[PDB]
Design a protein around this ligand. Structure first.
Ligand code: CU
Ligand code: CU
Lengths: 128, 128
């Protein structure tokens, strides 16, 4: 809360939120992802990946092609501002990034790169 | 085709049609399901299941619970009029069912029961 958010992705291929606001006073922001459910990583794993809206498509496509072994993310993709690893149910993960890598006036999107998920598992991240 | 239809479930969780009509003159009707794309069955499996519009959500909820190994369908689910196997990309499966199992003036829904897919993969079927 304020400089951290808890987000979850369930077995219904939905995130519990589709809008996160990062207050400009946070020096760093922390996302703690958990996966409520029963389905395993290779069938319904989720991750939380951040990029600009313009880069999202490319991240998702190259991510799909990197496979489960790469957590569906192209290794060292420079378009990815921050990301968790891919988790199956009952697993969790956390990521902290520098808010100074975000600029005011730019549209950012968070999403899951597990194949097909981004159509519903996505939302807005905004500096305010 | 006479007394048959071909439908494809792709890698974007989409069926290539949302309406099927069954000619009342057909004694039996066949659905031929294929899955274009490159994604494997555990990640993007699709089946085609038929029920009344009123039974679809109970079939989907109990199907998810039966899991992977049960092709995400409850064994001997009395509300399922007909269904294929769950198939991966490059696979094919047909189902033939008796048309006398369909009433005139009742609404039917076909859908995929792989978790999360019926939100997008579903359509109506009706006698004519
Ligand atoms: Cu996901
Ligand atoms: Cu499906």
């Amino acid at each position: 809360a304020e400089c951290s958010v808890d987000i979850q992705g369930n077995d219904q291929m939905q995130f519990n939120t589709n809008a996160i606001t990062v207050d400009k006073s946070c020096k760093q922001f922390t996302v703690n992802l958990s996966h409520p459910g029963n389905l395993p990583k290779n069938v319904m794993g989720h991750n939380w990946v951040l990029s600009t809206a313009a880069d999202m498509q490319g991240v998702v496509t190259d991510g799909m092609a990197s496979g489960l072994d790469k957590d569906y993310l192209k290794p060292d993709d420079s378009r990815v501002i921050a990301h968790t690893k891919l988790i199956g149910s009952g697993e969790k993960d956390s990521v902290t990034f520098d808010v100074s890598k975000l600029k005011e006036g730019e549209q950012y999107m968070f999403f899951c790169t597990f194949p097909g998920h981004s159509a519903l598992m996505k939302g807005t991240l905004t500096l305010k």
